[PDB]
């Protein structure tokens, strides 16, 4: 399948794509304003994520670090990045469908569209401005707006035992963004597109 990662900012992003495990395609490349990256995902692909990494400083060997996102100081990402992050989240040929989602359960960098490129889908948004509007105690300090897992380490807010509800934290991102999931038991806004769908995700979207 492929996925054509767009950046409409007026500010370079460092895409990313990873399984968890291992880099989907090249796992990362740097797209200034303007500029597409098209990449290939193959079928059956569970648990893909794809997101934006913002103020990166890399060497000529592709290591570095980046202010969100960042994957083990990797230009090509290998694992997944470190919060605050959009998310963009997939897996594919499940059952005969895809599923698709945005979560801001690692908070929320860069705004986001993620689409199908058929008709016979419909797309997933989280452009509002969280990051202006972030409450103190969430925003990171080098951009972006992290979840209150990651700042707090309770299972109030990580999920990792009983069972979590909602919060003031959670319901800031999810009043903003109702099509996101915004803490790990939200109710899903996951979207079933026909199986072997191709994608687009569009930073800073418009349209």
Do not use: H
Not at 106 to 119: D, E, H, I, L, Q
Not at 135 to 153: I, R, S, W, Y
Request: glycine share 12%.
């Amino acid at each position: 399948a492929t996925f054509e990662i767009v950046n409409r900012c007026s500010y370079t992003v460092w895409a990313a794509a990873s399984k968890g495990d291992a880099a989907l395609d090249a796992g990362g490349r740097q797209l200034n304003s303007g500029e597409s990256w098209t990449i290939n995902v193959e079928p059956g692909t569970n648990g893909g994520k794809i997101w934006a990494r913002t103020d990166c400083y890399f060497d000529d060997s592709g290591s570095g670090i980046c202010k969100t996102g960042d994957c083990g100081g990797l230009l090509r990402c290998k694992r997944f990045g470190r919060p605050p992050t959009t998310l963009a989240e997939f897996s594919l040929n499940q059952y005969g469908k895809d599923y698709i989602d945005i979560s801001n359960i690692k908070g929320f960098n860069v705004p986001m569209n993620f689409s199908p490129t058929t008709r016979g889908c419909r797309g997933v948004r989280c452009a509002a401005d969280i990051v202006g509007q972030c409450p103190a105690k969430l925003k990171a300090p080098g951009g972006g707006c992290n979840d209150a897992c990651t700042v707090f380490q309770t299972s109030e807010y990580c999920c990792t035992t009983g069972k979590c509800g909602p919060t003031e934290y959670s319901r800031f991102f999810k009043r903003l963004c109702p099509d996101a999931f915004s803490y790990v038991l939200d109710k899903p806004t996951t979207v079933t597109c026909p199986g072997s769908s191709n994608y687009r995700v569009t930073f800073c979207p418009t349209a």
